[PDB]
Design a protein around this ligand. Structure first.
Ligand SMILES: [Ca+2]
Ligand SMILES: [Ca+2]
Lengths: 329, 329
């Protein structure tokens, strides 16, 4: 159970519902109290804005704003921005970047994952079941009642469900998308050649467990649509979505190849030093000044991305100068 | 003095002449005896074929064939293929891959550099001056007489000069190219943003020496034209052309950034081992079973690409399993 918003309008609910829509507006994914009685009076809210990326019109998210007790977080250009420093209580969120994921976790039990480019995953702890409303549907493990359109009513119109959670009072109404591959037929051969890796023998373990046909067509559509420049990032995000979906099951897999989506972990390594090896499965509990060896958050998973390989001498990471120091003074 | 064929129809002669043309045919760059008296009776010849890469019609080279004493080399799909094993004399060429360059050298003194995708550079030793004919012009350090169109005549028509060196008797005549950026105006902003790095402070050392305006517009044109997919490779080749042109002067520079054209030298490193650090300047003389420490070819330059960093124990490279073994048994 985890919200899966990625690429161009691909969504997967907690209860396991897959739909699609595109719209250039502001939307909220997770709300507290559903606008009613404030039971826990926390009023958590996560919102996002879509920009017309790509000439096909298939917009993708650009910025994410998080509201928590009068505290606001702005995510844009790969840098975290905070607006509003309430002089009460304290900081309730932790900002941590792991691999190619930007992770923010709340003391309430809310965990968000950010690829810093397009994708985003939201998971909810079981104590908040049912009483959550948004585009991700009610967290009740029932794919039937996940279409509550701000009025406790389930409607078969995915477009109506998506439009019901717009934020700007004066914002253009979203509409059904076109066919990216029919729009760009000349890219179809290259797109199929690139996205065929998912059905290749490398991902056979996940193929034997889940059905990647939806993710396969998602990769094809994303590659077809991405035509204004930098299609490599579109393809990499499309693949990494299914990679994470397989990883969260529990069985680690490896899919990176120097010809496709190549990381450059050597760059962070300074001169005369080599302590950054890519970890496919995902690093276990680490040690650093902020998070000691004995302390770790197990709600996170292996994920992916370059991680430092600190020497046995000074294995603690610093997180301020991106190196392994013995201890932060 | 070095032939510089790269991207989509970009050529620079030994004597320093820059022109451009595109054509889907077979052409010869360097010929021996110019079809006349065989002085050294070596009859060296390098030929190439152009394929309609990209929807703009700007073709780029795909395969290179080398003729040397009845020995033929086929270069396609990133793998070297040899056709014709004469049962006389011996092998006169050495096939070696260094960094992101595939290098073949002849005992005569001919050196070729291959990026395995599009680009190619040809240098000539001084003993072969003047008596060489081809698209690269006569090797006499004179930009005036480099337009010999197979008849010892210089013609101001670059198109005519290019067509005069076609090989297939029945092959379509080449024509002047269009404007890639006018063809794809929506890509102009992204292309300028990507190609502006050359004029950025990183390459100021070469900016203070050579004039990169031609290379700047070449990068812009290449990024504009590359639209059928994989524009990242087009941009990377366009940048690396100027990078090599600056490197051959003598002053080493660094331009790689994990956000742009990122190498994945970590991949070659096996588990528990980190002995592949990217070298910007280019590795000095190496040691291996084929080429010992005392033996090295100094005609080559630093170039670029991932190189192994063998430990002080077993520093010899094997070249058969891509690792550093003590000595080949
Ligand atoms: Ca539901
Ligand atoms: Ca000349």
């Amino acid at each position: 159970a985890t919200c899966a918003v990625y690429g161009d309008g691909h969504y997967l609910t907690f209860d396991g519902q897959s739909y699609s829509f595109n719209g250039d507006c502001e939307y909220t994914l997770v709300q507290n109290h559903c606008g009613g009685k404030d039971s826990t009076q926390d009023s958590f809210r996560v919102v996002t804005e879509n920009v017309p990326c790509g000439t096909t019109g298939t917009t993708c998210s650009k910025a994410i704003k998080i509201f928590l007790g009068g505290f606001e977080l702005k995510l844009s250009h790969g840098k975290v921005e905070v607006i509003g420093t309430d002089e009460s209580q304290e900081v309730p969120y932790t900002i941590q970047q792991m691999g190619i994921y930007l992770v923010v976790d709340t003391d309430i039990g809310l965990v968000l994952l950010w690829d810093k480019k397009t994708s985003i995953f939201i998971n909810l702890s079981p104590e908040f079941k049912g009483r959550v409303c948004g585009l991700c549907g009610n967290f009740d493990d029932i794919a039937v009642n996940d279409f509550a359109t701000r009025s406790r009513s389930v409607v078969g119109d995915v477009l109506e469900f998506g439009n019901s959670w717009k934020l700007s009072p004066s914002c253009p109404d979203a509409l059904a998308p076109k066919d990216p591959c029919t729009a760009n037929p000349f890219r179809k051969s290259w797109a199929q050649k690139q996205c065929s890796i998912l059905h290749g023998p490398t991902f056979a373990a996940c193929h034997a467990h889940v059905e990647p046909a939806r993710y396969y067509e998602a990769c094809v559509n994303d590659a077809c649509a991405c035509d204004s420049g930098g299609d490599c990032e579109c393809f990499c995000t499309a693949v990494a979505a299914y990679a994470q979906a397989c990883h969260e099951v529990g069985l680690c897999v490896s899919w990176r190849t120097p010809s496709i989506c190549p990381l450059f972990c050597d760059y962070y390594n300074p001169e005369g030093q080599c302590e950054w090896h890519y970890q496919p499965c995902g690093v276990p509990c680490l040690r650093t000044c902020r998070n000691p060896r004995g302390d770790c958050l197990r709600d996170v998973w292996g994920l992916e991305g370059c991680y430092p390989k600190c020497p046995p001498e000074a294995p603690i990471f610093d997180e301020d100068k991106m190196q392994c120091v013995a201890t932060c003074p």
